[PDB]
Structures are given as structure tokens and as C-alpha cells.
């Protein structure tokens with residue numbers, strides 16, 4: 001679930017507030033479309049797409065499905081107790097939080113005019 | 119001509135080397151295509167189109183045609199002595215240098231992977 005996702009982000013990107021990614025580029029935040037403005041934005045678009053896939057497993061709502069996972073200094077793994085849904089969205093979140101850490105954050109890409117650039 | 123354009127940029131953005139604009143986004147540099155990456159890139163996209171318009175004037179080659187203009191303070195004006203081609207090109211360059219001075223320069227957009235991003 002989203003609360004867990006932001007803890008995942010905390011695990012991989014220690015001194016950037018999770019809120020910094022809530023309105024970035026064309027895809028970081030609720031929804032997204034157009035052309036990713038950078039590598040960070042692109043992490044979000046495959047995350048979004050990853051969520052789109054997990055939803056195709058019916059009764060699976062990526063936003064609210066809680067899962068089991070573990071943070072061990074910069075790394076993440078999903079753990080036991082996950083049903084098909086939890087396993088899939090946990091994997092989505094893991095890969096996205098891992099992606100965020102290896103992409104530069106460009107302030108110029110935060111809270112952009114979606115209308116103009118996307 | 120390009121030597122004069124370089125000097126125009128000097129006029130409106132003294133604090134930056136012209137070199138910084140020579141390989142930026144999808145449009146600042148020789149040619150261009152794709153989606154402008156930001157406002158500065160859009161300055162170049164517009165400039166490119168201006169040149170393409172000037173090229174319709176028979177015997178008009180924007181890159182090479184020398185024109186008359188003067189830089190005063192940080193303002194630019196095209197002066198007497200220009201034929202149809204020179205006037206058109208001078209105006210194109212004039213507008214571009216004025217545009218650059220009003221757009222933020224994002225370092226993340228310099229020398230980007232054109233095949234990936236454009």
C-alpha cells in the first residue's frame with residue numbers, strides 16, 4: 001500500500017523527502033501520460049504501468065493492498081505472507097524505489113505545467 | 119551570421135558562454151526534432167523554424183549572411199544596410215537571444231542522449 005511504498009522510498013533515498021516525488025515530471029504523482037521528462041520520470045512511468053498490470057489480477061488494488069517486505073540498508077526484498085496481489089504490487093514498489101535511487105533528481109522538473117510539457 | 123549571433127547572446131546573457139547553448143535539449147545545436155525539453159529548448163525550436171522561413175528567400179543562407187545590428191545595454195536592434203535576407207536573419211537571431219535571456223538554464227538538459235530523449 002502507498003504508506004509502505006513511501007517507506008520503501010525512505011529505505012533507498014535517505015535525504016530526500018518522499019513528498020519530493022509526489023509531483024515530479026509527467027508521471028510522478030497520481031496518473032501520468034506523455035513523454036517522460038527524465039530518468040526519474042521514467043521510473044514512475046514503468047511503476048504506473050506495473051500497477052496497471054497488477055490491477056488486471058481482479059480484486060487487486062495496488063494503492064491499498066498491504067504486503068510484506070524488508071529494508072536492509074539500501075536494499076529491499078518482498079517476504080512471506082503475500083497473496084498474488086501483494087506479491088505483484090510489492091514487486092512494483094520495490095523496483096520503483098530502487099529506480100528512484102539511481103536517477104538524478106532535477107528540481108526544474110518538480111511541479112511542471114503538465115499541460116505545456118506532457 | 120553565426121559569429122554575430124554569438125555576440126548577440128553575449129549582449130543579452132553575458133554571464134554564460136555561448137558554448138552552453140550549442141548542445142542543449144533536442145533543438146539547441148545543428149538541427150533538432152522531438153518534443154522541446156523545456157523553455158530554453160523551445161527558444162531554439164522557434165529559432166530553427168525562423169531560419170527555415172528565411173531560407174525561402176532566394177539566395178538566403180542564415181548561417182552565413184552578415185547583418186547590421188547594435189547591442190545597447192542588454193537590448194538588441196537590427197539596423198540599416200540589411201537586404202531582405204539579412205533583415206529576416208537578424209530578426210530571427212535577435213528574438214532567439216532575447217528568448218535565451220528569459221529562460222532558466224537546466225544543466226541536466228545539456229548534451230543529452232538525443233536518441234533516448236528526443
Ligand SMILES: CCCCCCCCOC[C@H](COP(=O)(O)OCCN)OP(=O)(O)CCCCCCC
Nearest residue numbers: 002006021022027028029030031044047048051052
Ligand atoms: C495529492 C497527491 C496524492 C499523493 C500520492 C499519490 C501517488 C501514490 O502512488 C502514485 C503512483 C502510482 O499510481 P498511479 O500514478 O495512479 O498509477 C497508475 C496506475 N493507474 O506512483 P508514482 O510512480 O507515480 C510515485 C509517487 C510517489 C509517492 C510516494 C508515496 C505515497
Ligand SMILES: CCCCCCCCOC[C@H](COP(=O)(O)OCCN)OP(=O)(O)CCCCCCC
Nearest residue numbers: 120124139140145146147148149162165166169170
Ligand atoms: C561560432 C560557430 C559555432 C557553431 C555552433 C553550432 C550550432 C548551430 O546553430 C544554429 C542553430 C539553428 O540552425 P539549425 O539547427 O540548423 O536550424 C536550421 C534548420 N532549418 O541555432 P540554435 O537555435 O539551434 C542554438 C545555437 C547555439 C549556438 C550559437 C552559435 C553561435
Ligand SMILES: [Ca+2]
Nearest residue numbers: 024025028029
Ligand atoms: Ca507528475
Ligand SMILES: [Ca+2]
Nearest residue numbers: 027029031032
Ligand atoms: Ca504516476
Ligand SMILES: [Ca+2]
Nearest residue numbers: 142143146147
Ligand atoms: Ca541539441
Ligand SMILES: [Ca+2]
Nearest residue numbers: 145147149150
Ligand atoms: Ca537547432
